[PDB]
Design an enzyme around this catalytic site. Structure first.
Site, PDB file in Angstrom:
ATOM      1  N   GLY B  48       0.831  -1.151  -0.077  1.00  0.00           N
ATOM      2  CA  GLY B  48       0.001  -0.245   0.068  1.00  0.00           C
ATOM      3  C   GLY B  48       0.961   0.715  -0.078  1.00  0.00           C
ATOM      4  N   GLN B  53       3.914  10.076   1.137  1.00  0.00           N
ATOM      5  CA  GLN B  53       5.004   9.132   1.401  1.00  0.00           C
ATOM      6  C   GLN B  53       5.600   9.647   0.462  1.00  0.00           C
ATOM      7  OE1 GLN B  53       4.829   4.851   2.172  1.00  0.00           O
ATOM      8  NE2 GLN B  53       2.774   4.608   2.409  1.00  0.00           N
ATOM      9  N   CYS B 101       7.719  -0.349   6.788  1.00  0.00           N
ATOM     10  CA  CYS B 101       7.039   0.458   5.453  1.00  0.00           C
ATOM     11  C   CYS B 101       8.346   0.850   4.599  1.00  0.00           C
ATOM     12  CB  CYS B 101       7.001   1.191   6.121  1.00  0.00           C
ATOM     13  SG  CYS B 101       6.514   3.114   5.797  1.00  0.00           S
ATOM     14  N   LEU B 102       7.990   1.154   3.554  1.00  0.00           N
ATOM     15  CA  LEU B 102       7.874   1.262   2.775  1.00  0.00           C
ATOM     16  C   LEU B 102       8.876   3.273   3.129  1.00  0.00           C
ATOM     17  CD1 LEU B 102       6.242   1.312  -0.263  1.00  0.00           C
ATOM     18  CD2 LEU B 102       7.810  -0.395   0.362  1.00  0.00           C
ATOM     19  N   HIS B 143      -2.566   0.821   8.725  1.00  0.00           N
ATOM     20  CA  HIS B 143      -1.042   1.707   9.089  1.00  0.00           C
ATOM     21  C   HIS B 143      -1.252   2.556   8.195  1.00  0.00           C
ATOM     22  CE1 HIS B 143       3.185   0.691   7.900  1.00  0.00           C
ATOM     23  NE2 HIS B 143       3.187   1.208   6.899  1.00  0.00           N
ATOM     24  N   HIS B 147      -0.791   7.151   7.912  1.00  0.00           N
ATOM     25  CA  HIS B 147      -0.134   8.139   7.559  1.00  0.00           C
ATOM     26  C   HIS B 147      -0.498   9.573   7.237  1.00  0.00           C
ATOM     27  CE1 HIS B 147       3.722   5.598   6.540  1.00  0.00           C
ATOM     28  NE2 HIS B 147       2.688   4.700   5.773  1.00  0.00           N
TER      29      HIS B 147
HETATM   30 ZN   LIG Z   1       4.048   2.687   5.737  1.00  0.00          ZN
END
Ligand SMILES: [Zn+2]
Ligand SMILES: [Zn+2]
Lengths: 171, 171
Positions: B48, B53, B101-102, B143, B147
Site C-alpha cells: 500500500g 509518502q 514501511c517503504l 497502517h 500516514h
Molecule cells: Zn508505511
C-alpha cells in the site's frame, strides 16, 4: 583486528553481559579482544563500543574520540577501557542529544539522559575507580553501559517523532 | 511513473493530510497522481502507499498485493483507491504482525492493531463506502490511514525489543 558489529534485531544485543574476572584480564585472549574492539571502534569512526556489539556478553566497554566525523560537534574523549561498570545518576538534570549507534546504522534519535552521573569501574590493569562524570562523557558512558544490560538507545527515544535516517534528518 | 518515496525523518511524514474534494477527482493531475502512486507502489513491491509518502499531504491511499515478495505470507489484496478514509475500531481483539514501511527501509516491527474495523471512504469515481473490514485488509488500511495523520508504525511498536533490520531478524 576489525570485527563484525551486530545490528539491531540480533537477540544478543538484548541479553545481559557478565562481569570480567581479575584473572581474565591477564589472559592473552582478553588483551587481544580489547585490541580488536579498539581496531573495530576506530574503523567504524565510532565514539565507543561495548563487547556485546561484537557478540561477547562480557562487561567490557571501550571509548575514544579525537576529531570524530560521525558526531562532528562532540568534544574529544580520551581512549580508555571500562570494565564491570556501575553507574548511578546524581541529578534529574538532563542534557539532550541526537544519539546514534553502530548497531543501528544510519539513524539518529534525540535522547535525554542525566548530565551528571557517578560511575564505578575497573581498567585493564585491574584498578578500581569511582568518579563522578558529567557532560558528553556522561552521555557516552551511559549509552555504552546500557549495551551491557541489553538496552539500545531506541529504547530511550524521547519521542519516536524525533527519530529517523541521517540522510533525511537534514539532507 | 515511479516517484521518490520520502524516508522517516522527513517532517512531511508527520504532518496532517487534508481531504480531497469531489471536483479534484476529475482534474487531469489527480488521475496522473493515482497513476504515479500505483506505479511507485508496484516498483517498490509494496502492499500500500499513502500520498504523503511521496510528499503530498492529501488523504489519498492506494493498496494492491498479488503475490507480494516483501511480506510473502500475507494473503492477496485487490487493487483499490481509498480517499478521505475514516476508520473506527469495532473490537479490542488485536492481531499481531511484523509491519514494515517503504518510508522505513529494511526494518520490521511487531505491531498489534484491532482486527476488525469500520472504514468509510470514497473512490476515484466519487462513491461513498462504509463497510466493516477485518483480517489482513484491516491491518493494511490502518497502517496506511495512519500516514494521513502523520503516524508511522514505529510509533506503535508493541516493544522496541521486537524491532530491527530485516537481514538480522532471521539472517
Ligand atoms: Zn508505511
Ligand atoms: Zn550503541
Amino acid at each position: 583486528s576489525v570485527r563484525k558489529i551486530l545490528r539491531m534485531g540480533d537477540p544478543i544485543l538484548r541479553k545481559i553481559s557478565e562481569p570480567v574476572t581479575e584473572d581474565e584480564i591477564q589472559t592473552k585472549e582478553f588483551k587481544k579482544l580489547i585490541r580488536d574492539m579498539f581496531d573495530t571502534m576506530r574503523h567504524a569512526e565510532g565514539v565507543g563500543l561495548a563487547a556485546p556489539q561484537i557478540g561477547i556478553l562480557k562487561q567490557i566497554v571501550v571509548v575514544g574520540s579525537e576529531d570524530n566525523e560521525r558526531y562532528p560537534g562532540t568534544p574529544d574523549v580520551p581512549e580508555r577501557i571500562i570494565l564491570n561498570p556501575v553507574i548511578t545518576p546524581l541529578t534529574k538534570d538532563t542534557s539532550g542529544f541526537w544519539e546514534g549507534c553502530l548497531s543501528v546504522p544510519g539513524m539518529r534519535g534525540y535522547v535525554e539522559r542525566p548530565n551528571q552521573i557517578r560511575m564505578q569501574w575497573m581498567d585493564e590493569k585491574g584498578n578500581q575507580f569511582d568518579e563522578t562524570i558529567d557532560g558528553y562523557k556522561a552521555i557516552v558512558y551511559q549509552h555504552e553501559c546500557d549495551h551491557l544490560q541489553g538496552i539500545l538507545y531506541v529504547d530511550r527515544l524521547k519521542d519516536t517523532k524525533l527519530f529517523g535516517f541521517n540522510e533525511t534528518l537534514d539532507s
